[PDB]
Amino acid sequence: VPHKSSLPEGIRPGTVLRIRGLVPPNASRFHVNLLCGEEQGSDAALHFNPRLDTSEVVFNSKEQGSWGREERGPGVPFQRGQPFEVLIIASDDGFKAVVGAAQYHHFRHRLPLARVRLVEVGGDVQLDSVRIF
Amino acid sequence: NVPHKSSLPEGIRPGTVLRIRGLVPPNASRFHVNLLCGEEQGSDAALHFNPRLDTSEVVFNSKEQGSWGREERGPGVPFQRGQPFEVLIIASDDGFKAVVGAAQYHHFRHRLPLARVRLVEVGGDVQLDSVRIF
Ligand SMILES: OC[C@H]1O[C@@H](O[C@H]2[C@H](O)[C@@H](O)[C@@H](O)O[C@@H]2CO)[C@H](O)[C@@H](O)[C@H]1O
Ligand SMILES: OC[C@H]1O[C@@H](O[C@H]2[C@H](O)[C@@H](O)[C@@H](O)O[C@@H]2CO)[C@H](O)[C@@H](O)[C@H]1O
């Protein structure tokens, strides 16, 4: 099942998104999106997109239809058939991505944190839990 | 067991997430997490976070000039003798947010300025697996 949930007020510096799940043994890719509205293709403050098929993790944002400059984490801290824990942490400057007891990548903001209205987590992924503190 | 005392790598700013995983010993009385503003003993503390199994409570408070402030108390004791626990302390620009296990537990509004906190301490009757500052 894909996870979609609303953040009607916004994310402030201090919001923490915790995701726990499994990467299916035949996964291609999955994604974590933080969006500015209820429509698919709405602006994306963060697109967190680990591709097991091509062995990269990709970070970017979307404004008015078009992707920004892509950012790529180092190595791939996911593996097929194996469970994971991701923390996405919001600062005043960017997003911290923590995967498996270690920081992984920092993503300078491109969109005001305040314009975020939605968390969606879909793709080739089994979710045990998705929660925002 | 062993205690954790750690200097901070970027102080404590809005977005800092301390995660503590461990277990409460079967003969535990009380343990604590401190966000201290100084290295010496009795120093001011922005956050004192003290699960007490002996008096069935969790206290939250700040210390300034040796003088404890207004104590706050969590809902219940989400801590068990002989059992693992996972605690997150998240610094927002409003307060600190204690998350125990899977749910938010309490929110302590800042009292001391976030600028003063330069040390993390975790000790007492707590067996520690991992202490990470993110
Ligand atoms: O930036 C994230 C989106 O990028 C798209 O893929 C990019 C690809 O990563 C890049 O290296 C280059 O080859 O062009 C592609 C566009 O054709 C994905 O297609 C998209 O879903 C997002 O992941
Ligand atoms: O404020 C936290 C500190 O409380 C001290 O104990 C308090 C106690 O919590 C309160 O119920 C009342 O009885 O006054 C006591 C002071 O004797 C602790 O001694 C200190 O370690 C903190 O946990």
UniProtKB/Swiss-Prot annotation, chain B:
Q: What induces it?
A: By p53/TP53.
Is Nucleus among the key words of this record?
Answer: yes
Q: Known CDD domains for this protein?
A: GLECT (cd00070)
Q: From the record, give the cysteines joined by S-S bonds.
A: none
This protein's source sits in the domain of life called: Eukaryota
**InterPro entries registered for this protein in UniProt:** ConA-like_dom_sf, Galectin-like, Galectin_CRD
Cell compartments where the protein resides: Cytoplasm; Nucleus; Secreted
Q: What is its main location?
A: cytoplasm
The coiled-coil segments of this chain are none
> Where do the annotations place a beta-D-galactoside binding?
68-74
Q: Which residues form the Galectin domain?
A: 4-134
Q: Which GO terms describe its cellular component?
A: cytoplasm; extracellular exosome; extracellular space; nucleus
Which UniProt keywords are given for this protein, alphabetically ordered? Apoptosis, Cytoplasm, Lectin, Nucleus, Secreted
Subunit structure and binding partners: Monomer.
Tell me the function of this protein: Could be involved in cell-cell and/or cell-matrix interactions necessary for normal growth control. Pro-apoptotic protein that functions intracellularly upstream of JNK activation and cytochrome c release.
Q: Which PANTHER family match?
A: GALECTIN (PTHR11346), GALECTIN-7 (PTHR11346:SF107)
The entry's protein name is Galectin-7
